[PDB]
C-alpha cells in the first residue's frame, strides 16, 4: 500500500508541474514524501 | 488549341504574332452556380433514395 501510494503521489508531482508524463524525479520525490515525511 | 478554347475545353487565348497561349485566370468556382448544380443532382438523388 505504501508502494502504491508512492506511485499515486508520483503522478501528483507531475501535475504540480503541469506535466503529462511521470518522470523519475517524481517517483523519487514521491518516495521521500510517503516514507520520510510520513 | 484553337478548337479547345472554342469548345470550352480550356479557357485561354492565342497570340499568333507572339506565338504563345495565355490561359485565363481561374474564376472562383464557389462563387457561381456550379456548386448548387452539383449539389442539386446529389440532393435530388438522396431524396429519391
Amino acid at each position: 500500500a505504501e508502494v502504491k501510494g508512492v506511485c499515486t503521489e508520483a503522478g501528483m508531482y507531475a501535475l504540480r508541474e503541469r506535466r503529462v508524463h511521470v518522470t523519475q524525479e517524481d517517483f523519487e520525490m514521491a518516495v521521500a514524501k510517503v516514507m520520510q515525511k510520513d | 488549341v484553337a478548337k479547345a478554347i472554342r469548345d470550352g475545353v480550356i479557357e485561354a487565348s492565342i497570340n499568333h504574332e507572339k506565338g504563345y497561349v495565355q490561359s485565363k485566370e481561374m474564376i472562383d468556382i464557389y462563387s457561381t452556380r456550379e456548386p448548387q448544380l452539383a449539389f442539386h443532382q446529389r440532393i435530388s438523388f438522396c431524396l429519391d433514395i
Partner: protein, 194 residues
Amino acid sequence: QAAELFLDTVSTFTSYELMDYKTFVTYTVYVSMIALERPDLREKVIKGAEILEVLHSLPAVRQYLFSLYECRYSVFFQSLAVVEQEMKKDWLFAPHYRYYVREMRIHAYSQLLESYRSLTLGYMAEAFGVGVEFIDQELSRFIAAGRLHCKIDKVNEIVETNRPDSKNWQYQETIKKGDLLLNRVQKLSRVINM
C-alpha cells in the same frame, strides 16, 4: 494519424518487440514531415527534446528533417533520395514509398513558393540543385493535380503563386467523399431489395 500517435509515445516508447527506438524516432520524423504543419513541426519535432537526443546518433535523419525546415532545398532533395531507398526496403513504407516522396516534393515546392509572389524557374532549379527542365516537369505535374497553388509562365520562366480559398478545396472533398458515401448507399439498397 501515425504522426499524432508516434509523437505522443516518443517519450513513452517501450514497444521494443515491434522496433528499435532509433527506428521508431526515424519513423516518427518521417511521418511528421509529411503530416504536420510548419508550426506543429517546430514545437514537436524540431524542438522535441526526446527526438533531438536520438537525432544526435542519426545524422542522416536529422539532416533530412532540418534541411526542409531550414529551407536547404538542395540538401533536402539529396536527403529525400536517401530516405526513398530506405522506405523501399522497409516492409511498412514500401507500398507508400512513391507516395511519400511525391508528397514531400510537393511540400518542398510549396514551402519555397509560399513566401514569394513569383519565383523564376532558374532560381527554383538552383535552389533544389536540379535543372530547369526538371522543375518545369515536376511543377506541371503537380499543378495539374491541384496540389500546388501556382502557375508557370513558360515564356518568361516565371512561376506565379495563387491563393485559392479553403472553400473551394472543402467543396471538392465534399463532392468527392459525399459521392463515395452515396455509392455505398446506392450499393447497399441494391443488396437490400434482392
